[PDB]
């Protein structure tokens with residue numbers, strides 16, 4: 001039999017979540033979400049079974065000054081996992097070190113905050129001095145700011161970095177809690193803003209999308225699975241299955 005593939009992933013609603021049950025759940029059955037449904041589909045098309053393993057350091061992945069990676073990206077570089085199936089952003093810096101499938105979803109960075117402020121854009125947010133802001137540490141949103149040559153975003157990076165231990169949160173849940181309880185706005189991918197703002201009516205998007213990019217399945221460079229995964233993603237795309245999965249996990253509209 002084909003060796004069981006190791007899948008690295010991360011908890012992120014509604015992609016990967018703990019299933020609620022009154023009885024014990026083991027192995028893959030502990031998890032549900034868009035990315036678990038994606039895995040069920042891809043594995044049917046490619047002919048494998050898999051073992052879902054949450055990334056030990058709880059990070060998506062960024063590189064330090066020494067060029068060392070962490071998170072799911074590191075798991076792939078180091079051949080600890082065969083695939084990363086998660087809301088994993090396809091980026092230039094990552095594509096140089098891992099192989100991504102074609103995208104299965106598109107999105108862009110935007111701002112999550114509470115309601116009732118005059119802040120209407122990143123420019124407004126960077127300029128004002130009442131509300132703090134940040135991003136999840138060691139994800140692509142942090143990296144977008146770190147790498148930006150756009151003045152507003154350079155200032156925003158310098159601010160986030162100056163108070164990093166502070167402004168950069170461990171994960172999206174900590175970020176959302178910080179938005180709800182303190183004067184802090186979270187730079188967040190739009191598909192997650194769409195999800196949370198239809199569930200918590202105290203939350204809102206500020207401004208539009210600041211960029212546009214995709215999520216892809218990650219594999220180590222040279223993986224004999226990447227092309228097969230790409231072909232399967234295109235099948236699911238064209239058959240309307242990715243759209244159906246999005247509707248399933250985001251439905252419906254809960255806030256004015």
Ligand SMILES: N[C@@H](C[C@]1(C(=O)O)C[C@H]2OCC[C@@H](O)[C@H]2O1)C(=O)O
Nearest residue numbers: 060088089136139140141172188189
């Ligand atoms: N997709 C990103 C991870 C993350 C982000 O950096 O925006 C981290 C997390 O940030 C808040 C919600 C959603 O935007 C999540 O995306 C990555 O592949 O590095």
